[model samples]
Target chain A: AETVSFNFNSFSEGNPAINFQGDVTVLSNGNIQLTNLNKVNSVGRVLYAMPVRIWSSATGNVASFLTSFSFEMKDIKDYDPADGIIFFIAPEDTQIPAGSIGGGTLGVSDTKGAGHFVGVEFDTYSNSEYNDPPTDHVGIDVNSVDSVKTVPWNSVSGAVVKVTVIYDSSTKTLSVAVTNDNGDITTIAQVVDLKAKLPERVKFGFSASGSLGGRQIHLIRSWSFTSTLITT
Target chain B: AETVSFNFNSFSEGNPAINFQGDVTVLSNGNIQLTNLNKVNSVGRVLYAMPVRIWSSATGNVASFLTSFSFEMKDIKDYDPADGIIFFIAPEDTQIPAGSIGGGTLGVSDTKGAGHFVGVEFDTYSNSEYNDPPTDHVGIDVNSVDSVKTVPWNSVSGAVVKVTVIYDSSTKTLSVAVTNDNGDITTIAQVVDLKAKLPERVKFGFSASGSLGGRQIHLIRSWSFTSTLITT
Candidate 1:
């Protein structure tokens, strides 16, 4: 199988060699904290350095994959605690974006325009500019932040939430489910033909943003992703 | 110039050999009518036959292009004239989609899932399910019908409207402008890196939908498109 896969049961043990950009660090207790408790307008991104061979050149078929992660979010002081977290797949040369659109874009997008990527966003803030649904929700974003599919969610601050995202290449469907510590579940699925949308190779990552000085903080406890494609 | 260019001053004058799907028909007077004025839940599409070489493989650079069209839409009778229209670009093996999603989708998207495509939609009928901005508007869609950028509009029923779409590879930006007969204009622009969003070879087209028997009809009077990329 020409594939890409990874697992991090806890970050404290190995201090995983994941590529990081801005305000990202693994705590001694094994939690991955994105954004600083004391910093304002903070953003962070973590990507698996290697590219996934998403498709077969001769057969023209995309692969299938599954990803799951567990995280917790906090509402720090200051009337702000916002934005969200996203699991995204973008092009080979993808970067951490170019500007500051703190608290609303979740560090995955900028104020100027959308970057080319398909993302599953756990949006906690209501942003009229992005036409975000009013309240926390799980949205399936195809390139643009305006989600093609969205499911209402109520995420309890400080509660650990587990999210699983799956792609079925045969059916051309991508589905995501979120279960919070209280057993509350939110799910959304849609058809997305990735072969025609994204390039042949891509990287997967997590991006989150928070206002400086603890408006919000995202804590990642565990993550595992798997992908496979039959070769020639 | 390794470019693609075409012009249709009037469909009636030259009877352009455009590929049609579903209920598309060119009138003797040079107008291209998509969907029958009499059919219920009608949908139609017209596409350029050849593929556009969107990127240079060796240099990893995408090309820039501009397109414009003049069209008229009618509120035939009942249901507020229904849905809308879109200008789109998709992959090489693209088809007219597989199902029926009338009125709200503008024939560009479907009910089950999103196809791989980028579209500029002149959506006349608002569908809350898509998080539409409550009325006629111009939206930029990437893969999914949910738009990343939208500008409000009021397309006078049966009046001619001109639309222009442009993409700049250097800035990775795409822009669209709509001008109705009254000289009223609506504009929206966003940075979209097509090199990462779409495949190397793609086709461009127009799609529109209507309810059977004259709820709405899309009339195309003139159209023109041009694209260029430097040679190896």
Candidate 2:
């Protein structure tokens, strides 16, 4: 059981466990508010829960990891809010985009490619350009906000949602499960070679955005992660 | 009216009106809040509300401009707050500095010359290395956080303070004025050739940060700007 794990229940304010940008904050109550309810137009937020250097290395590569977290979106305006948030794995160079057009961008990868990233998005709004579903949905993305696989989900404001993501290198499978407030679970799986797409080193985090017509606040109630890299 | 204006009141999300990094939010009440009372240690926030290209052009140079905003800093922790906030004009490449040491950096400009810039800082804390005054003050900065000129002022937490900045090209002068909660005004002026110090095209915005021992929540209540550029 050679693994690294962290429980956010007792997380400290200035701990080195996290690196963040945009409108992210760790509440005293142990919840991390990824984005405020009062975020500006075209704004985005990001929180890299772990640093880039920790997981990937020259000696070996990441073989497996499990991440579990609970999140909620509340105070949505106009009965519509966008775009949504994501759990992501991005290259070290990954950063928040430098413009006002971030709502559809998903706050992870931008129009211009700056990082090699993969994301599990919890999208709320629909965009005709991206061929998004009419309602809230979860999808898997590779280097783009346009998810390769998607499933419809009813996103209710102020509702708590639980999400889990697991990756296994041996089988090269990535899986995601989302549990709604009413104890409904939705699961999806994908098979891909992470070594082919991602560099030996990567950064893990969460990204979120709000669009012009609608906005919502994304909050992280609690989080935990465990990672084990195989030297062989 | 040959003017450009952006009111947080009608600001649209995902419309690309501004560029920002670090932690920032726009309240539903139309106030742009820079940081949180529960902000992490050594965290910073930056918000550039408009595109630099719109204000500066190769064919035309900025001749004059007026910017006004109302802001407040409240919910101070530990009776010691920091560092402060800055209104700045910087090169387009300017970005947030790296590392967990943004308390003194104030998330504006780093110690090294990353960008050609100038700023007017409303600093709240004193750092010995920066030669800060014993009390809160207003300072003019050229390429560094070390103020060229500073005026001591009492920074009362939870008070709504209105600030105005004006620049004139012919005279090459920049002036700053502040109105406290009690309607008392403190004014200061400086003469410097902005054209000589800054790129013809520059980015404009606000940056703020909190320290390890003390933390503060900085909020921007309202903001407006008008500029005149010379086509010659």
Candidate 3:
């Protein structure tokens, strides 16, 4: 019942691009707040990744995570940012490779599959294996979950959405909902199962990877997670 | 400013078939809630036209005006629903055409359009002349004032947006911003002068018109209006 919170003051004051490796970016009113610098470290072919952390849990692992975030962005032509929203739960300590340092971090920036974890990817990028050209939406994945699990943004319009993910271990169910703030039209843009083929105890946080095509910018406005654990 | 709220009570709701004039069927939303209904009347060939109301200042005319609203909706297959979101203005008692009792009760719902008016249309189902087909976004129709102007929704991705029209008595400046939530990625998705051709406003509100290829839904969620009457 004790929820999880990311103050994000670190980005409120510090340069996020240098800290979190630009995994997350907060842009509001033309100001970039948290530009996560989370890069997939690939050295000599060994990719290094990071474990997405939440507040350490003490009692029930069912924790409700909530936070407010924003970012500042510059318009780049032909580089439409995709895979705007992504959450990670990787092995205790591992690194994933940045796909060619490709546009938008290449869906987790991890290509080596070095850990055992899961990801809820909101991919905006055009991954032929998953979506057709110019599609974006929310997705669910494991450490090795394919991008196909990711929802297309167009399916939800890629507008900053209010997202909620509930992982019920008792039912092995991960229910995800992406909502729009369109006042009267609030409904699930996408609902996916995060626990379809995974076990319990998964790390939860936002991750974003984009490509350079069409001045694309991806992001997460407000995020909340309810799991059995209470993260520190 | 006092906001007039509609708890959705105090209104009658029903559905009519879109079968032009001869259809005698009702529409159901698979159990969806359609708590509002505006009856359509015959005005020449037009059937379901609604009036756009503008409350003028007690002592002066409405020199400028702005309003925003959202709606709920489902999908439309054929004819593209020709879904359009419009802003209108007219004389107090001028009856705008209410097309057939079916589709007419759809957009510009219950109001009249007789005086000065403007239609900032986000036409989803374009009819070659009024708009192009197969996309959703904004269009400017200053009526007899100027030619139509349009901006595609596909142009703005992963961004919050603001649509504004500033009428300085004569020429109107319509602009947009792709912004994020308070702690979001950025403020305003992108800004484009809706009236790059200089638009003028005589009326303001929202109008959405859609025709069903099969069965489709459209909704407006939130709306607000502000004037220079604010002395504080």
Candidate 4:
């Protein structure tokens, strides 16, 4: 098969082989867990595989791409989790952008300005600045943490859930689906121009941070991404 | 990069793109769980890629090969789990051979006869017919579940463990090393002629079964196999 896909059943700490970083730890049982508990004002980011151009700037050759993963989030006792996790395509710098707060920013952006990227955010704590709903929701964000579109999610903490995100260059549509452990699925889609929102090449992975006394655990059991247009 | 290699971090069920059969289910969490609690007599198998003669029968061209994986097995309460899991090279028959039993056979064979294959077994339950060690052990078997060599394993139920199996065709030796979650290692090796034991090309995979009222679970977190001599 002419595809580049990866599965992360286990995460090894600081193992150059897998390229994992930040608060992410590979549990002994092989699950990849990300948590910001006890670490104040911190952000965690995991960069998978290598950076690739989702859409070529020179030729404007954007190919369809698909990414999928299984994840779970557990809220800290008595505290509503702030921020959330995001599947993102950003510049190769794996660092959390400066001025980004741990709470509402989800370690993806800052109050000063948004990073140059596109992302799908699973927001738990609502932020009016981002026009988020009070209930847990999913949103599509472009160049800013303030989402362009949003939808509510009946999220169950500690339960395994599946998510698939796809981008079709021909239609300029970015679509996503979340499936609960029981197989119930929720879906949403939006038209986006990558040429306007992102660079010619971008790094893909996940980022998350616990917000003000709002602690939570983010873990990815499996993940894969592929594109026919990518060459290198 | 020229070598043939594959790493299975995820199991896509019902995905024709990936070859698998029987009691096998890939958890949303990315673990390949290989048992159904209620189903006692069953065999699960997972095959990777396609036919590649790691060792040539005609030219006697033998090359080094390496396989590594992380796994965990939880013993059924009080009942000594029968059979076990085996990393094997067999004819490309995806079906469980007729008359195969669960426990002592480890779902790899029947008492009537052994199939054309070579395997490394991480055996738990003991069977007199198979000359098994009284306790858990790792064994090298040619054809039958009856082992030619065996070594005891200090197993920790439910804890993640790592195992690496290597074959050197030039020396006609196959070796296996097991590392427990605590980092303890058990190593063993045997010399054999593959030209006489297997066909020119064979399939590589894993097989596990629960037998004789012995219900257990077998799971694989990540697996990788590579052969220098194999070519597509």
Candidate 5:
């Protein structure tokens, strides 16, 4: 199918899944937006993860991906603050065990299975999940949020960022790149393809959350998928 | 003579006090409304007892009668809440202090001398000026903060109460009374006038401030003044 554009708020006509699944949406081109200010925590809430499954002709299968985004946070005031994170891509039906620690949402994702996936993490705080250090850093995960190859990505500064990932079935490789807040260069990139743990088709979208420490807002601008026809 | 009601925003156009004198109109049925907040501190840059001064009649003169009214403060978001007090009758050219100190403008008004006045303080924080046991009470000061007498008032219960002070110039007496926040008739009265110090023509108005400890908003609904010619 050709590329199509659909805003999440008005995706009911084109994409039913993005409309019917609770208050979420999935665009024809693969963009997902989650917004409900009233449901925001007293502090704020993060964008978390937005997952999508793409069918590549080259590989003759589908791939599951996740995207992380954030919004401008206001209203909540604090003296000392703690925060949470968002992941980009992971395996299907696997629950990320975010602990009830300092920030409850700081946990490990359960992306263990046959799936070719990558993850982008917006981690503002530290948890025992990662060698704890109070630092602001973004990381790229290949196949899992634990025991996986990682890439340190630049922080997405503003309310929106255009994120795109293409699984080139022709090369049996996955390439990820994200444009920065200044609308400039892609701040991060990674390529990982291990034919062992990914499915031809998988569940996709973001899983977000906030903790008792404080909250942050995340605004999903858009999500898209690409295909590469290949022969086995 | 009908009392003249002047709008604060247009203080230059035949307003209450221009240069050093104002035409005291008998507000027989009219009430003073500080619709647009024009404080004396903002314009005059006088570091005195308070910011805004709303005067009715000069002290000792028939024109020195101040009206008693109520007020409803609106459009208030976050403000320095440490300040609140009404100067019953102050002499001409008395400097009021401006800062976030405990006693608010009261601290400064006392610094300047020979001003006959009764101060009704809606103090939000603790200060040594009022005989506060850990700063939880209101005081009636005759001269100094240390020398002032006070009673405890609760702040945890967010309720609005109407405070009324009636001064019997004939008996040279001032009575302080507080109504229940439930709009009921639980009145606490304190009889004693601070004007006995310097019985001169005085200016009357309200003052408010805030400090680092706690904050509150001050409002005056309406006030009316009546001057009986003490003809000999």
Candidate 6:
């Protein structure tokens, strides 16, 4: 019924257009730091604040969408890296999951309620309990933390990595493309029925875990998203 | 004590300099096919038949070396991807590990004896039991299939990826660089003592698995290596 589009070139402190919580910070330079070095088990997240209409309830038609973002994950000095930054979509009224400010949860979920979410996780840790491949990778979560499809994520420490997610309702395919600083684009795609899996409205955002000892700083440089919902 | 260097621009059937085993094949033109179609749980490998002295026993000094190879991995019709091609170094007397003809083992090990080898693995499938990050990645295994340090490997099915491994004895560092067709060079390094890890003489080779359903084909186009061992 409606089309929505927005772009955040950068973030400033107290940006009302966005919602932030936990260890999140706005670098003096405007970048959004999802996790910082102040404390252990740091957690942080940011959302568009307002829910977006993702489909037409009456017609049960899904939206075709695109979301692009640039982010970086790096170790904090001698602290070894334990990266887990996830771009996610959840129920419009969802609250941050409990104990997600720690390791493995990727700041998304620890139990059931939070489990009902879809996300693109950039995980570098092999949180063995989660059936994760012990490598740096990109995975698509289908309301469950254990990913369905995954691909390599080329995150060279502090180097900026660009990621884009596209959903084509016509083909019922969801795809993700990750480009390294070298401009090499790697892709992965999977078919799914989003209209049956999610609600007509959703909150889109990012969640990150500094992991056990506040080992890394997650920074978001920019983000943009657009969605088109066609209904009878 | 000695310096050795050689290059194989291409390969032919029954190439005298190389040793082939299992499902290994030599393509019509001149490429080493580590794994192929026509069967399930396919496994293949090729090695430098002649053992190379990696260190000088008299001085207990290891060699500084470099090995480069070009390879590709892809799926057969209607098949999925289960990539596990490992460049490994083992005792000259080592044989293919039992049951390695199947999945996850990466054609390297299924037991303790085969376990005592070092390897650089290009893996895509996450065999959860091995503590792998479920994604496409490259890892350095120090005498154990469970990798210590790993990075992403950009292998766009059928696209050639040039891989170079450099071992600097002086720094006790083993580094690997993978360059995709796009000229993007991805690197990962780890500090290790080769002299302490294996015997003075070793067999270096490539081992691959077509996985459970014999889904993929692993191919090697060219290879080269150089080493210098200093001694009293």
Top candidate (DockQ): 4
Worst 10 residues of 2 chain A by lDDT: A46-55
Which candidate tops TM-score? 4
User: Candidate 4 local accuracy as lDDT?
Assistant: 0.74
Residues A1-232 of candidate 1: C-alpha lDDT, one tens digit per residue: 4556678888752444577777788888888887766667778778777788778778786776766799988886665657678888888788777776566667767774377898888888777888888878888888777787786677688999977665656556675556556443444567688898889998888888866433677888889876756465
- Score candidate 3 by DockQ: 0.02
Model 1, span B1-232: residue lDDT tens: 3677788886642334577777888888778887777677788888877778888887776766756799888875455666778888888777766777566666767784376888888888777888889878888899877887786678788798977665655456665556556543445666677888898899888888875432676888888776766454
Indicate the worst ten consecutive residues by lDDT in candidate 6 chain B: B105-114
- Could you give me the TM-score of model 3 versus the true structure? 0.39
- Tens-place lDDT per residue, model 5, A34-150, is 322233322112121333334544655543332323222111234212343444444454443432122423333321311235455555545555443345545555554442433
Q: Write the per-residue lDDT of candidate 2 for residues B70-183, one digit (tens) a residue.
A: 776764434467887888887777777755466767776555423357888899988878888888999888877878888888787656588999988668788999988666
Q: Of the pair 2 and 4, which is ahead by lDDT?
A: 4
Error of 4 at A209 (Å): 11
Off by over 4 Å in 5: A1-15, A19-75, A79-87, A90-117, A132-134, A146-158, A183-186, A228-232, B1-232
- Locate the minimum summed-lDDT window of 10 residues in model 1 chain A: A179-188
TM-score per prediction, in order, is 0.49, 0.48, 0.39, 0.53, 0.35, 0.50
lDDT of 6 by residue, A1-232 (tens): 4688999865766668798877888753345788766677787889888898887778877889999998867554567666568898887876667666467677777733137678888887766667777677888887765778888765676456889999998888888989886778878888867777768898899988766553676778779999998868
User: In model 4, what is the error at residue A129, expressed in angstroms?
Assistant: 8.9
- Scored against the true structure, residue A5 in model 6 reaches a CA lDDT of 93
Q: Taking the tens digit of each residue's C-alpha lDDT, what string does model 5 give over B1-232?
A: 3233332211122332532211111111111222112232220111112222222234342322333444322222243334443434455465444432333444334323212455655444555444434654555655444325566655322233445566555455455665544444322335554344544344455544434433443333334444433422
Q: List CA RMSD, all candidates.
A: 20.6, 17.3, 20.6, 19.4, 22.7, 20.3
Q: How well docked is model 4, in DockQ terms?
A: 0.02
- Model 1, A55: alpha-carbon shift in Å? 1.1
Better of 2 and 5 by TM-score: 2
Candidate 6: residue B125 lDDT (0-100): 74
Which is the better candidate, 3 or 6, if ranked by lDDT?
Answer: 6
User: What C-alpha lDDT, on a 0 to 100 scale, does residue B208 get in candidate 4?
Assistant: 85
Summarize candidate 6's per-residue lDDT along B1-232 as a digit string, tens digits.
Answer: 5787889866766657888878888643255778766667777889988888888778888998899998877555567777568999888987778666456777777733138788898887777677777678888887666788888665676555789999998998999989886778889899988788889999889988766554676778678998889876
lDDT of 4 by residue, A1-232 (tens): 1245665544556656455556666653455666557677557777775666666655667767888987777555566766668888887765676755676677777874377778888888787776778788888988877888988887776556789999888888999999875568888898988867776666788888876677777776667787657343
Better candidate number, 2 or 4, judged by DockQ: 4
